[PDB]
From a paper:
The principal CPS of the human pathogen and Tier 1 select agent Burkholderia pseudomallei consists of a linear repeat of –­3)-­2-O-acetyl-6-deoxy-β-d-manno-heptopyranose-(1–. This CPS is critical to the virulence of this emerging pathogen and represents a key target for the development of novel therapeutics. wcbI is one of several genes in the CPS biosynthetic cluster whose deletion leads to significant attenuation of the pathogen; unlike most others, it has no homologues of known function and no detectable sequence similarity to any protein with an extant structure. The structure revealed that WcbI adopts a predominantly helical fold: the N-terminal 100 amino acids form a ligand-binding domain fold, with the remaining 210 amino acids adopting an entirely novel fold. Based on the structure and on biochemical and biophysical data, we propose that WcbI functions as an acetyltransferase and requires another functional module to carry out this function.
The crystal structure of WcbI was determined by the multiple-wavelength anomalous dispersion method, using data collected at four wavelengths. No radiation damage to the crystal was apparent after the first three data sets, so the exposure times were increased for the low-energy remote data set, which was collected over an interval of 360° to a high resolution of 1.56 Å. The coordinates of 24 Br ions were used for phasing. The high resolution of the low-energy remote data set was crucial for subsequent density modification and successful building of the WcbI polyalanine model (605 residues out of 622) by SHELXE. For the correct hand, the correlation for the partial structure against the native data was 36.5%.1 The full WcbI atomic model was built by ARP/wARP using the polyalanine model produced by SHELXE and the low-energy remote data. This was found to contain bound CoA, carried through purification from the expression host, and will henceforth be termed the WcbI native structure. The structure of the CoA complex of WcbI and the native structure were refined by PHENIX and CCP4, respectively, to resolutions of 1.38 and 1.56 Å, respectively. The native structure contains 38 bromide ions. Interestingly, in the native structure the CoA terminal SH group points away from Cys14 toward Cys41, perhaps owing to a more reducing environment of the crystallization conditions. The two structures of WcbI presented here, obtained under different conditions, suggest that WcbI allows some flexibility in the CoA head group.
Author numbering: 4 to 311
Write the structure that this text describes.
């Protein structure tokens, strides 16, 4: 009989399960009992898991989910509390990294975007009445400003992760499995994120290996299907000049974007971003830009150096 495990958390949780199941040694030992991610699970589903899934688990692999997110019922502390006596609950870091695409965020406070990501610097430009043609002419100046600020950006990305490692989203329990220092050490040589919250296969393989190491597996047991890339739906493009800090960058101006598995060239993509922001009231676009910018001074700096 294989032991039973579940992986609970963000979109990254099912992806981690896919990756772990692709290792032959791991799949020999473990059977996944699937849990819906924290942003999908219904009340009916989360109640049933506490009663029927969790008490039957040998391993609960989870990302921190605060009580404040959707209530106690969905929280990692509450769920792991229902593990059986001889069970093991291991927390895995929520991966978020804006270092490749420091102008990109999610449009909180604005209509839902069908692609899930918007360019916040474009929001700031729209508020300033910078037209889309001017913005396109200034992509290199924006990228130059970001490149001057690359260490500050990285330092902040690392600090954000380290603070969360303390585990306030998991009742103060320090995160068991993390990759912060790996990300900082490798981010310029290898593409580790397609979007701020979608690790590439390379990063997913590293976090899955660290889970297997935490379970006591020997190095010689650890391998994964290299063809798997679970969070590849949308791929943000790095800005000109800034992209040249990274080893994997090419000799074109800016790579095509991928959104919902479809490619769009950088110019029509950024023109659509302008048009999307222009649909909303300018005051609301401004409130959005101010929220994003408040803890990201490089974004207001780039807008100033390029356009003011
Ligand atoms: C992160 C999440 C799983 C739970 O959040 P939480 O338990 O309340 O605590 P977190 O610190 O993770 O999230 C706090 C906020 O800071 C953001 N954040 C998370 N990690 C971060 C980091 N290292 N640096 C900067 N910002 C970060 C989160 O996106 C979240 O933003 P929001 O409140 O505007 O949604 C979920 O709320 C989330 O942010 N993801 C939404 C996107 C999505 O659907 N992806 C997978 C589903 S969760
Ligand atoms: Br799953
Ligand atoms: Br998946
Ligand atoms: Br799976
Ligand atoms: Br519900
Ligand atoms: Br909590
Ligand atoms: Br526990
Ligand atoms: Br959205
Ligand atoms: Br141009
Ligand atoms: Br977290
Ligand atoms: Br680390
Ligand atoms: Br490392
Ligand atoms: Br790469
Ligand atoms: Br990869
Ligand atoms: Br175990
Ligand atoms: Br050996
Ligand atoms: Br591997
Ligand atoms: Br890519
Ligand atoms: Br690459
Ligand atoms: Br690139
Ligand atoms: Br391209
Ligand atoms: Br409109």
């Amino acid at each position: 009989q294989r032991k039973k495990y579940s992986v609970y958390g963000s979109c990254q949780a099912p992806a981690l399960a896919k990756m772990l199941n692709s290792c032959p040694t791991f799949a020999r030992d473990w059977e996944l009992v699937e849990m819906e991610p924290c942003f999908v699970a219904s009340e009916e589903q989360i109640d049933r898991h506490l009663a029927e899934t969790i008490p039957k688990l040998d391993l609960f692999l989870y990302q921190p989910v605060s009580e404040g997110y959707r209530g106690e019922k969905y929280s990692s502390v509450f769920l792991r509390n229902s593990m059986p006596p001889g069970g093991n609950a291991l927390s895995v870091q929520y991966m978020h990294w804006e270092g490749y695409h420091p102008t990109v965020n999610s449009p909180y406070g604005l209509p839902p975007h069908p692609e899930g990501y918007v360019d916040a610097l474009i929001a700031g430009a729209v508020v300033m009445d910078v037209d889309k043609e001017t913005y396109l002419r200034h992509l290199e100046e924006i990228g130059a400003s970001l490149r001057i600020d690359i260490d500050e950006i990285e330092s902040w990305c690392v600090d954000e992760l380290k603070t969360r490692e303390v585990g306030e989203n998991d009742g103060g329990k320090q995160i068991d499995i993390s990759v912060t220092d790996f990300i900082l050490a490798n981010c310029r040589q290898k593409r580790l994120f397609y979007t701020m919250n979608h690790p590439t296969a390379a990063l997913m393989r590293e976090i899955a290996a660290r889970c297997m190491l935490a379970l006591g597996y020997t190095y010689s047991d650890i391998s994964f299907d290299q063809n798997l890339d679970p969070l590849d739906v949308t791929k943000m493009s790095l800005y000109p000049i800034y992209r040249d800090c990274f080893d994997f960058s090419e000799l074109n101006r800016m790579n095509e974007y991928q959104v919902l598995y479809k490619k769009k060239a950088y110019e029509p993509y950024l023109l659509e971003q302008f048009e999307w922001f222009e649909r909303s009231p300018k005051a609301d676009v401004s409130a959005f830009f101010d929220r994003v910018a408040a803890n990201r001074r490089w974004v207001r700096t780039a807008l100033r150096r390029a356009f003011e």
